[PDB]
Structure 1
Amino acid sequence: GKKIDFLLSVVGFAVDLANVWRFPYLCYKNGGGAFLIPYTLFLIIAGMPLFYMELALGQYNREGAATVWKICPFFKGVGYAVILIALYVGFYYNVIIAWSLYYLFSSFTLNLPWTDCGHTWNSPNCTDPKLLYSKYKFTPAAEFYERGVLHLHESSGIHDIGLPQWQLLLCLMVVVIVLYFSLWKGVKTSGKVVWITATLPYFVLFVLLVHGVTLPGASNGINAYLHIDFYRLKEATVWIDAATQIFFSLGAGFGVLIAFASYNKFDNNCYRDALLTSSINCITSFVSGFAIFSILGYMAHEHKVNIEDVATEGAGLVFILYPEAISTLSGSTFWAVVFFVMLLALGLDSSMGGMEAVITGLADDFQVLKRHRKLFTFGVTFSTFLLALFCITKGGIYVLTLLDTFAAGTSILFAVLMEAIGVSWFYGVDRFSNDIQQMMGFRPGLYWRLCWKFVSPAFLLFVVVVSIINFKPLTYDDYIFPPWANWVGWGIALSSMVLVPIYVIYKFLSTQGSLWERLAYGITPENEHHLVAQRDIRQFQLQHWLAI
Structure 2
Amino acid sequence: PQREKWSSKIDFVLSVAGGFVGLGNVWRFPYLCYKNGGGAFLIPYFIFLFGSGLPVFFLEIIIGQYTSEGGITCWEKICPLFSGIGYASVVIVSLLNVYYIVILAWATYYLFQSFQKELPWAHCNHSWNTPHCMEDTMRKNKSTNFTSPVIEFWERNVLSLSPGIDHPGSLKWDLALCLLLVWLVCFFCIWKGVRSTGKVVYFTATFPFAMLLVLLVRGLTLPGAGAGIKFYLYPDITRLEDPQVWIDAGTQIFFSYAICLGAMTSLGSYNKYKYNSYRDCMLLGCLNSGTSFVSGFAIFSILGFMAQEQGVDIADVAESGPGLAFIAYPKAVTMMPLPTFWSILFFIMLLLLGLDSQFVEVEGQITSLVDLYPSFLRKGYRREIFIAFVCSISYLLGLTMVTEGGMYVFQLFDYYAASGVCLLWVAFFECFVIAWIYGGDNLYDGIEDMIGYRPGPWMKYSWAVITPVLCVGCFIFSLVKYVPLTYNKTYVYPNWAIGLGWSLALSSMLCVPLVIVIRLCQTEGPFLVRVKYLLTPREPNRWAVEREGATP
TM-score by length of 1: 0.92
CA contact (8 A) 1:58 1:259 kept: yes
Secondary structure at the residue paired with 2:348? helix
Q: Deviations over 1:235-294 (max 9, x none)?
A: 122111110100000111111100111111112222112211211122111111111111
Residue number in structure 1 paired with 2:87: 80
In the other structure, the counterpart of 1:109 is: 116
Q: Does 1:51 align with 2:57?
A: yes
Residues 135, 5 of structure 1: CA spacing in aligned structure 2 closer, same or farther, 3 A cutoff?
A: farther
**1:90–1:11 distance in 2 versus 1, CA, 3 Å:** closer
Shift of 1:526: 3.2
1:493 has 2:505 as partner? yes
Aligned to 2:415, which of 386, 392, 405?
Answer: 405
Cα drift, residue 191 of structure 1: 2.9
The one-character-per-residue Cα deviations of 1:276-334 (angstroms, maximum 9, x if unpaired) are 12111221111111111110111011112121211111101110111111111111010
- 1:523 aligned to 2:523? no
* In 2, Cα distance between equivalents of 1:336 and 1:212: 14
Q: Could you tell me how far 1:519 is from its partner in structure 2?
A: 1.6
In structure 2, what is the Cα distance between the partners aligned to 1:221 and 1:445?
A: 39
**Equivalent residue, structure 2, for 1:539:** none
Task: Please state how far the C-alpha of 1:488 moved relative to its aligned partner.
Answer: 1.1
Amino acid in structure 2 at the alignment position of 1:61 = T
Q: Report which stretch shifted further, 63-72 or 43-52.
A: 63-72
Structure 2: distance between partners of 1:110 and 1:267? 56
**Equivalences, count:** 526
1:148 to 146, 157, 172: 157
Distance across 2 between alignment mates of 1:494 and 1:452: 24
User: Where does residue 25 of structure 2 map in the other structure?
Assistant: 19
Q: Which of 436, 444, 457 is the equivalent residue of 2:455?
A: 444
Corresponding residue SS for 2:273: coil
Opposite residue 369 of structure 2, the aligned amino acid is L
Decide whether the 8 Å contact of 1:185 with 1:374 is kept in 2.
Answer: no
Partner of 1:258: 265
Matched, 1:207 2:207: no
Partner of 1:385: 395
Q: 2:442 aligns with which of 402, 414, 431?
A: 431
Q: What is the CA distance between 1:86 and its match in structure 2?
A: 0.4
How far apart are residue 136 of structure 1 and its match? 5.9
Q: Which amino acid aligns with 1:506?
A: I
Corresponding residue SS for 2:198: coil
Indicate which of 378, 389, 411 corresponds to 1:370.
378
Give the superposition deviation at 1:143: 0.6
Establish whether residue 127 from structure 1 lines up as the match of residue 145 from structure 2: no
Contact 2:219 2:302 in 1 (8 A): yes
Unmatched 5+ stretches in structure 2: 1-7, 541-551
CA pair 489-12 structure 1, distance change in 2 beyond 3 A: closer
Residue aligned with 1:493, SS: helix
Shift, 1:475, TM fit: 1.2
Shift of 1:14: 5.5
Residue of structure 2 equivalent to 1:483: 495
Q: Matches of residues 141-220 of structure 1 in structure 2 within 5 Å?
A: 141-152=150-161, 155-185=162-192, 187-220=194-227
Letter aligned with residue 139 of structure 1:
S
The structure 2 residue matched to 1:267, chosen from 253, 259, 274, is: 274
Q: Find the aligned partners of 1:503 and 1:104 in 2 and give their Cα distance.
A: 44
3-state SS, counterpart of residue 258 of structure 1: helix
Shift of 1:167: 0.4
What is residue 46 of structure 2 aligned with on the other side? 40
Residue identity (%): 48
The alpha carbon displacement at 1:13 in A equals: 4.7
Displacement after TM superposition at 1:109 (Å): 1.1
CA contact (8 A) 1:135 1:310 kept: no
2:110 aligned counterpart, secondary structure: helix
CA shift, 1:137, in A, is 7.3
Contact 1:141/1:323 (8 A) holds in 2? yes
The answer to whether the 8 Å contact 2:19/2:361 transfers is no
Match of 1:395 among 389, 393, 405: 405
1:207-260 alpha-carbon deviations (Å, 9 max, x no partner)? 111112221222211222222111111212211111010000011111110011
Question: Can you give the 5+ residue segments of structure 1 that lack an aligned partner in the other structure?
Answer: 529-543
- How much is the aligned-residue C-alpha RMSD, in angstroms? 2.1
For 1:359, the equivalent position in structure 2 comes to 366
d(CA) in 1 for partners of 2:532 and 2:12? 42
